[model samples]
Target: MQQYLRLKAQHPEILLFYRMGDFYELFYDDAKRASQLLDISLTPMAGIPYHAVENYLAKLVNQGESVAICERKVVRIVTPGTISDEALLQERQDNLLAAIWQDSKGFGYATLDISSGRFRLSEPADRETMAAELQRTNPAELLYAEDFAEMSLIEGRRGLRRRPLWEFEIDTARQQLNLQFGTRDLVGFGVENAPRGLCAAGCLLQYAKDTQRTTLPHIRSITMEREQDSIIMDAATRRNLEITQNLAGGAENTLASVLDCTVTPMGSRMLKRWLHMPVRDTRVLLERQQTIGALQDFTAGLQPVLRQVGDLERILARLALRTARPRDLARMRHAFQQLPELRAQLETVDSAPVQALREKMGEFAELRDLLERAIIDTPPVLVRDGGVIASGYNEELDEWRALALTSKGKALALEKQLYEELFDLLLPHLEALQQSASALAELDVLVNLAERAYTLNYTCPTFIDKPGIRITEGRHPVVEQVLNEPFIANPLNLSPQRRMLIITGPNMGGKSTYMRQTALIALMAYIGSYVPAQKVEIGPIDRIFTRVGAADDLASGRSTFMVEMTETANILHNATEYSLVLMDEIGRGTSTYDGLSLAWACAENLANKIKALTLFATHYFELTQLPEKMEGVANVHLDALEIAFMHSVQDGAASKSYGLAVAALAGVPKEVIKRARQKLRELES
Candidate 1:
């Protein structure tokens, strides 16, 4: 009890699971809470059988609880973001721990995928930029200074923790970074001048160290990300466009789902990040496009090899953390064995990026040879069971195995020692191995994009120096895939003279789909993927804004109209001439006149003042006159039959909204339709 109390005092804010014999026991409040949380019977004391504790602990941590596990007075803390157990992590997504700090200059952000040791830090100039970074990463846990003023930015996220303010001090943070990186200064990491970013990174590393209680040898370096390096998408834009997650918060029918054909988890994760942070650099895009084109013929051969490769990033992390099992080594060995074939395929490519990738994926024949001889064909999950190391690899281990026939415990210790020896041998190549893994991931993603482009008949978009967008026969990637019949393609042209398109059409007439497809194609081009279009020409676009959805914030007590107005306000305030803006029935949540007036004013502002490449889809026919009133405004609409939609965009305003026909098709009562038609005729007359 004394030991439990003393350990419990250390992590006062979290629950403690104390080990006793075969059961991990919880006392008093923790006992009651665990009883309710795990739905297990509780006595004066609560206990979970040691073997089954992982399942319970996973549940607790997933529910935003940090738990301290005490095994005979040795405490190990487990938090949601710090967990590295294979059973507790998502195989496809990054398990990230993020930190946010703000000084007088701006907001500093840092994130660490502790499972993979991918650490990055950035400085966002404002609250919105910070929120966008958070939304993009979607970390499993977030740490913020205790006195952070912008609570709204971090609210509604899981694993929200208020860390000590002093942890974000620049001097202390520099020292922590120096000690962890074994360097006198952060100049080598290119973050020496970024004090706030370093502070956030330092705070994040300290928290990870506190929870893990181990040396993070896998975290060899930190990267500083500049906002100007990529196209800036706010949180609302990402959500509205459904870039990675759909409106219902699922991956299905999203842009990423339609385009992600990568075979490896690392590549899949990289693709998701690419969609989130599309590059603005034309050179990078061109390089990726060239690589994709070069890999068009090699995908069939390269995929088989890539499919055999394991998640080396996480495996390396586990190895560095000293938690790697026999299976991790076996997987690593298997991955290394495939390098020759992967490199051979890469050597045939003519692209500069492909050549660079081949160079980066160094020949690890020595490491592969050692692992192949040391580890068995199929190693056991644990080293204690002994049968992991091959028979003839080590003479001492072989003798210990022979002796294990008589004595098991001593032989198991020998096997564990051999495992550590192998780990130590691989430790020196950690950086090179990590680089190869990243190179392989890039190759996988490029090949995936190429294969997708070939199969879907997509074309590589050309970039222009002028500020305009032109796509010929562009189709929505997700919609085209999901449709049973065929998807009708549309052409969009936004130039300096005709920048805003006022698309007036009825419901179910494909207005939103056309706008969304244009945005998606432009975004695909920005990310260096072949867009689903016959031809595409894009210019420098700093941001993409969408006011398309009717999302009401019921939790925050904001109505649909309020949400619409707020998003529209953001677009109006921030959109520049080099931005793409999509507005779909923006003000439809209010009364008809009020909606029409606001919609007209917004179109005027965007066209006459902001001059952004705007797609305004509205039911208000009055907006079609903007082409005559403004220099850069044009009118286009989806043509419709009397009762059926042609789903085609034409150069003219819709004659009238086919509301009665749509309502009839939608199973509205015949009497109600008849009365509505009569009232409509009366109003028209």
Candidate 2:
């Protein structure tokens, strides 16, 4: 009780995750809130074990809570955004720790994913761009000077920490960075020019070091983000298009799911990033497309080798943190051993992309052979469990290991064989191993995407320097996966000259599916994945905006119509000639005449004002006359073989109703169906 009070006094605002014998106990308010949040029983002295705390820590931190853990002592303080413990992190996702620096000069932000050691620095126009970056990274924690918290208000933000304003001093931050990287100058990293960017980078690294209580060797380099480097997609745009994540926040229903066939976690992570940030430069995009095209043909030969490889980047990260088990090193070595074959596979290809890729795959023969000579083939998860170091590497350590394993009498003589001997071998080759691991991860992503392209029978996408989209026989990646039968392919060519396609179709027709598939295929092409199309030629699309489904944000006290209108307003405000906009049943939440008027106005703005490639799917046949009113607008509709079944898309507008047929098929009584038709005729008259 006394120890708890003392620790609690030191961190009054922070929740104490007090470590008891086997369980980490929480008291009073901490216990109360944690119990409710985690859906566990709330007791006065309730506790959870260290291992069990990962589940709780992730839950609490996500809600923006600060938790200080007390074990032998207060080991570290954790917030929603920054957690060093691997157990508390999602293996597939990068856990980014972001820090913002706002001054009279400008706004700059730095993000660090300790799990993967990805350090990024950027200077942005406003808080909105930073917010967009946050959305892209989806960081768990954020840090800023408490004084500027009001100026930097992020939507849907929580788990924020306010350090002292002095912590962001430019000179002091540079010094911290220099010390961390063992460099006297920051110019080498291109961080010295951007003062605020340096501050953010320094602050994030400092905070990580303070919490992790270990050296981060994996974070050897920094990436400077220029605004023009990649096409920017805000949170709304990403959500609307369902690029990397679905509307329900799951990967399964997204374009990422369709493109992901990589055996390694690193590949899966890279694939998501690719979808999130599409290459803006046509040349770069073309290079990716060409690479995937060449590799797709050789997927049959490459997949078997790729499947045997493990997550190299993560193992190297663990090693850098000094938290890696013997098994992690072994897993890493297993991947390293396969590099020669991967390089050989690439040698068979005759393309610049493949040639460049082979060069980047790297030479890891020394590292592989060293690992083989130093460590045994299979090591246990715990280093202290022993039998990790090879016998020939260290004779004394081998004798102890043999004695310890064979007889209980010499147990004390083991003296932790795995840690001591493995450390000796690792210290020499850590830097080499780390570099090779990154190359391995890149190779894994390449091979994985290639295999996916072949398996899914996706065709290579071609990109032009112009602003347009031309997809031949394109299909939705997700829908194709779910459907047992062949998906109905549609060809869409949207350009500035004839931009808008206003489709008037029946309620149960394939209007939504066709529009969604078009957007998904374009996104797939941009991300360098072979799209689900017979052939694709896409231009540099800046953003993709969609209003496909209707839902109210009841939590924020917004109605369905308001949500719909708000999205429409954004599309109008932001979309350009190099953008794709898809709207389905846009004013359905309002009255009939009002809905029609709003839809009519929106279509005009998209065609005449925005000049964006727009697909306006609506039931209001009146809106089909948009092509006549606007130069760029064209009319199209889904071809219904029967009253409710749709087959393909055809040029023309529909002036018909399949509502009665759909209602009858849904088991509505014949009397009600007859009454509905009579009422429809009366209304029409």
Candidate 3:
């Protein structure tokens, strides 16, 4: 009584699930609330039945005052069940603790149900069977939900569990994009890039080259919201899962989840997305069933939490063992209901109810402390670090520093903690409650798509025209979404009739994307994949040559023009009827005469020699004259208007390099540009 009052006085807001000899004994107000809300017993005595001591007589006179600080400083006691240790495992079979409060994140609530047997986090029912739920979860939003289990959150530098999928990319592929999984793939996935596959890779690279960068960073961002149906769906399917592999993934493998090792039922649920496959299978069913079966084997995995719960169950189990009368069985059943319910509430998003329910279930706190201590101290007797824990005992203290946890494993462990809790903590009891299991469902959408390469079946109903030198109608999956703007079908039909198209345009006028898009379509056809077009028919190609954007390579001593003409020359020499040629603003790096002459001659040669699908965008509109002289040559432009751009766009593009104008619009000072333009006019005239 003295200890309970002292602790309660110190931490009033904290509901204490105090460990008594055989159970967690709530005192005064805590006991009353626990009885009312959670509907557990209301014991009024010194720890219960060890020869019943005085009841909660402390509240008799100071009925309305805080029990921890009654008028006469009287003491009270209420023990629900005993704490489980080897010592009192038999007497108090059922015991638990809980906590409650108004959570700050507002939207929802959570609960942590704990007993000597197991620890479980609860949530409100997550069924979104109607329009209301769908509205709440924005239709375009890609969800990465988690089950409210006995786990915690994983954090990056923010101390939160979820890491950012960055969500940003090199805007035009010319900009430097920092990423983790961007560059060259791991080199051993054994995947081949057919024409279309090569096209996808080329499309990404072309996007990069246009941005003026040499390399592509690994992509880390996620598009949870997208306007394009196909693109959004494609990304969502991939993000949720990779391949169901005729085998269920659950906790072990769900594309890029943190959980690799699924040693518990909660962990298995972590892998139950059913989010990816195009079709279902028996293999997936058996494997998922295998996992589910193991999950139900509560004995091995439910120990710690069950052991805690056994603080109550132990009394019954021991009673059965020695034939003790099951007098408090009904009250014990009511408490068990609290276990699952408390767990369900914690998983709820409603913060108020979760908070309100928790105060009545506060005994879970003491159980959590004791359970963690036992795990830290005992370790697993059956398995330790992927190996057996030496049959009868486990030396955990000596193992902590000695074990080498993999980085992924470390992340997984912590992330598991982040979600809701650590469940394998309650393995023992779950083992006892084991029953028949269900089958796993297998689905492999990626594999199914890969298998259809020969058939080439995927088709689009509408045509989106993307105009360029050798124009194509369809293009990028991501870009295809923002469809309010007309999908320009570029006329990049570079062949014997038209092998060169000199395109002149201002900034952000769809010039670079047009080139990349056309090149990508052919690349896709060559790589043996579906092209982003109505019908992509192709011939074998050597290389897709691109010389789009640039900067001096200081250490390599490679000048922009030097790098420029070199790549251009490489294509003129190597290009066959089967090559993709793309060049944007090729001569802008040097003087007008020099640049114009070079671009003109290059167009002349490509028109005659390469005889391929060639597209070129340049500011030097002077080179457009090649179409007049050469038979297989043409001219195009990135449709940026001069008048509307200034008045309507608030400033988008002009005919020439509008760098200064753009800088000014971007908040660069007026006087600095005003003087610089004065000097520019003098130089230009």
Candidate 4:
């Protein structure tokens, strides 16, 4: 239904994850569509085919025939927990599909949820957060769509308009949302514009929440707070290494999305905290990423093989985290041996094909069983048939001889013989095992055998020059090889005003790569390793978050629009000061008006709000208006660019030329480029 309406209304398509119990199930239309198109199974409703049901529901969501309608799609984030309950199973209850339809209130169902599992819509429960959201999301009136557990809606608050709101219950768990009716605009006067000192209270609360967080924390609650005085710090330390950016700017293009490397719930949160890097330099971020990577590697190495095997087990089951167990002995032993090979394989090749890795993972089950039995078997101790106990003599009686003692201890000797026959065989094997005994080894075999596995896991403390970020000449080592030519190295110095480097040129003109390269340098810096750059000066970043490229969603469960906004929101609520932000096409995903507003707001936030270094790429030519409107931001067009459109001149400065010619020159076939250029000209004109 979400997709149907989105398509009919001409909205960008979305994958709707309906909140179903135990799982997020995509039903009917999307399921069917994904099944055929993406080779996934499109599920059928209990009564209706998902396809037909979605066809009908789409019409309902077209949002009043009077609204401007366009073809678009959205993701259906379905969860069984909300839908499979006994209540909504009634014949008269509004079909879960009915949630997608738009009414005077808002869309019937909400696909995105921050909280776990439950997906019903209702009024705000977290008041401060709610009020902040309201100030953030300005609406005419808060709509009360549905309720559950309690009355989620009532009358209005002070200085707010209220009306008699409709109330209905689909189910206790499958509650609905309270939306504002009048306008979908940013809430006025609700941004955190208070004095810096006032926000300190909020920051402190955020810090406490952070260190103490055990499970998934909401994105809004993720922030950066460093204490001035701390017991955990060493005064002897001349300088402390800091984390700046994990990746820059938008969510999609950030390191988390790119590498899919986050294993922690606060993975996203941790990245945001890293982004507020007081330095905008790529050298710093690269240093931090490398440093982090080493620490992670070292820590993982130091862990017992049993623990490592447990990780693979959890990944396979998608279960809660795993702990070391007796069952993991053999597999642990094998992993101790095989981990190097696995890491090498992943590093060299694209990891799309994982069957081989899966087989490696399967090794754990067998290893675990062996270890379990080893842990369980207990044996008895051995004793001699001729007893050794003797009674004390008062210097009178001679000590009993062997024969005399035997006769005296005959009964106990018989019992000892019987005990030896029944048990007491193998008791010396318990203390024979060592972690680094190469008789059976894992990682010591990596490089001609090093100091010891322990040494490999414990690296010496490293300090990189942190005069902020200073990269003398840097290039993308990965891309450099693929080009089969020497890559260009350039100096990139970002100061406060140079905080935002808005690179301009026709499409494919180094803008995206530069964006990625800058981000990668920071990532590598963060990990703490030598970079491919000539000479790099560095600082530390809090995080690096990027939204570089938009991806095609066959069934990722989001409308393009919804995904775009979600990515945008992730950047906004999460960014910190000591971070590097990379944004590509800040607002190109929505309507021109909406895009402009979003782009403008994002640019302004980077400049004034957090003050992080931002690498912003946009087709919005008007963004060049930045230097005039704001201070510190500078624009640098690609050398391959020019002031006029280049058509006949193939290799001249191409101010308006799409870099398609470069591809053609590199043997992409002239005809394909010719046809593409025709369409390009048509769009451009």
Q: Which candidate has the top score in lDDT? A: 1
**What residue runs in model 2 are displaced by over 4 Å at the alpha carbon?**
1-81, 84-86, 101-107, 126-128, 149-155, 181-188, 249-251, 398-418, 641-646
| CA lDDT, every model vs. true structure | 0.84, 0.75, 0.37, 0.39
Residue 614 C-alpha lDDT in model 3: 75
Residue 24 of model 2 has an lDDT of 81
Residue 153 lDDT (model 2)? 60
Assess candidate 1 and give its lDDT: 0.84
* Model 3 ranges with Cα > 4 A deviation: 1-472, 478-491, 534-540, 643-663, 672-685
Which 10 consecutive residues of model 1 have the lowest summed lDDT?
401-410
TM-score of model number 4: 0.37
Off by over 4 Å in 1: 72-75, 404-406
lDDT of 3 by residue, 64-86 (tens): 12222221322221222212222
Candidate 1 lDDT, 1-685, residue by residue in tens: 7878888787788888887888888888888988999887898598889878878878987898888887756456888888888878777776888998878888889989886687899898867677778877888899988888888878878989988887788888899888988989789889999788989998899889988887888787888888567777778878878887888988798887888877888898888878888899999899888888888987898888998995777787888888888888888888988888888777777777789989998989999889888888977766766589888888887776676544566667777788888889988888898888899888889888989888989998899999899989989988889989888889888899889888888778898899888888888999998988899999999888988888788786999999889888888888888888888886778899888888888888888889888888877777777788889888897888878678888998786677778788889999999999899889989
TM-score, per-candidate, Cα-based: 0.96, 0.88, 0.33, 0.37
Model 3's TM-score against the true structure: 0.33
**Window of ten residues with lowest summed lDDT in model 2:** 405-414
* Model 4 bad stretches (over 4 Å): 1-467, 552-558, 589-594, 641-654, 659-685
After aligning candidate 1 to the native by TM-score, how far in Å is the CA of 469 from where it should be?
Answer: 0.5
Give the range of the ten consecutive residues with the poorest summed lDDT in model 3: 435-444
Winner on TM-score between 1 and 2 is 1
Query: Residue 676 deviation, candidate 2, in Å?
Result: 1.7
